[PDB]
Design a protein around this ligand. Structure first.
Ligand SMILES: C=CC1=C(C)/C(=C/c2[nH]c(/C=C3N=C(/C=C4\NC(=O)C(C)=C4C=C)C(C)=C\3CCC(=O)O)c(CCC(=O)O)c2C)NC1=O
Ligand SMILES: [Cl-]
Ligand SMILES: [Mg+2]
Length: 284
């Protein structure tokens, strides 16, 4: 399949809810060839009144590799979930995360979870049946997933990719409907709290997202770290001063470096840790 189709869908839909404007990042991140010149990375970026950054990375290889990383980051005044689509596809295999990632914790407290997901449980139920739970995964990743997350692995077929496309569109339209209803925060302390929550999220992903190894192989370590911190998770430098180890001290090694492990806990949650009503039940 061509994930460019989905980027086109999303930009068109967004422009019926607001007006996108070009991000300044478009002058520094647009097109990049891999070191062996066989793979092209295509990058797009935009902003809007409530959206700090809407950005896509699309990778098409002559080998069958197709990658989409598409995200919408809100301005800290709008405590919206972060829209997240991370599709890693090869000739035969698909490894997929699609979610409205919660800005604030939905595990211990209830207010934010009810505010944003109460009316989306049926949407998550629709696709959890069609795109089955992907199995055990990095336990720290669940800190960032919503009760409607689609985490799935599947073999390539016309039917499975058709379902994936329908899910992306349904989930992105749901997120745009949340954006419609997002009113700006006026309390300065709350804006700071929303900003730290976003910075913590960007800091986690810029350090530990699974795609970083593939990027490093394609364009080398130096440019990959640049694309990761200044484009994909732009804001890790500007929205806060805390380091990855400030937020996640469990990863501090005996020498003060960040532990090479992706997961300090280990991979867990062999079954979906939310029940059919979206209540967290997580075992292992
Ligand atoms: C907080 C948010 C968040 C997201 C979105 C995410 C996705 C994610 N990607 C995975 C695999 C994978 N993902 C990729 C590749 C890519 N993947 C991409 O998203 C891109 C852009 C590429 C390529 C450039 C590969 C190659 C694997 C399998 C190998 C591995 O697990 O390293 C896994 C399973 C491995 C694990 O359990 O760690 C998850 C949960 N995890 C998170 O914590
Ligand atoms: Cl694997
Ligand atoms: Mg070259």
């Amino acid at each position: 399949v061509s994930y460019k189709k989905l980027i086109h869908f999303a930009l068109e839909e967004t422009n019926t809810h607001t007006l996108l404007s070009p991000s300044p990042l478009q002058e520094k991140y647009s097109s990049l060839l891999s070191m062996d010149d066989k793979t092209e990375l295509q990058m797009l970026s935009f902003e809007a009144h409530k959206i700090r950054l809407l950005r896509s990375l699309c990778i098409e290889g002559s080998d069958g590799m197709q990658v989409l990383d598409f995200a919408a980051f809100p301005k800290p005044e709008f405590d919206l979930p972060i829209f997240c689509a991370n599709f890693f596809t090869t000739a035969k295999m698909n490894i997929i995360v699609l979610d409205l990632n919660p800005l604030h914790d939905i595990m211990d407290q209830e207010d934010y979870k009810e505010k944003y997901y109460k009316d989306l449980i049926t949407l998550g139920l629709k696709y959890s049946k069609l795109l089955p739970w992907g199995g055990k995964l990095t336990s720290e990743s669940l800190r960032f997933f919503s009760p409607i997350v689609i985490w799935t692995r599947f073999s390539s077929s016309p039917h499975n990719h058709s379902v994936l496309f329908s899910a992306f569109k349904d989930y992105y339209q749901a997120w745009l409907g949340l954006m419609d209803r997002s009113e700006g925060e006026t309390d300065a302390s709350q804006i700071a709290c929303n900003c730290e929550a976003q910075h913590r999220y960007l800091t986690w992903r810029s350090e530990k997202d699974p795609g970083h190894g593939v990027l490093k192989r394609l364009i080398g370590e130096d440019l990959a770290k640049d694309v990761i911190t200044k484009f994909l998770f732009n804001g890790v430098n500007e929205l806060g001063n805390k380091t990855f180890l400030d937020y996640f001290p469990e990863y501090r090694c005996e020498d003060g470096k960040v532990n090479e492990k992706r997961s300090m806990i280990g991979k867990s949650f062999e079954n979906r840790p939310w029940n059919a009503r979206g209540e967290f039940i997580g075992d292992r």
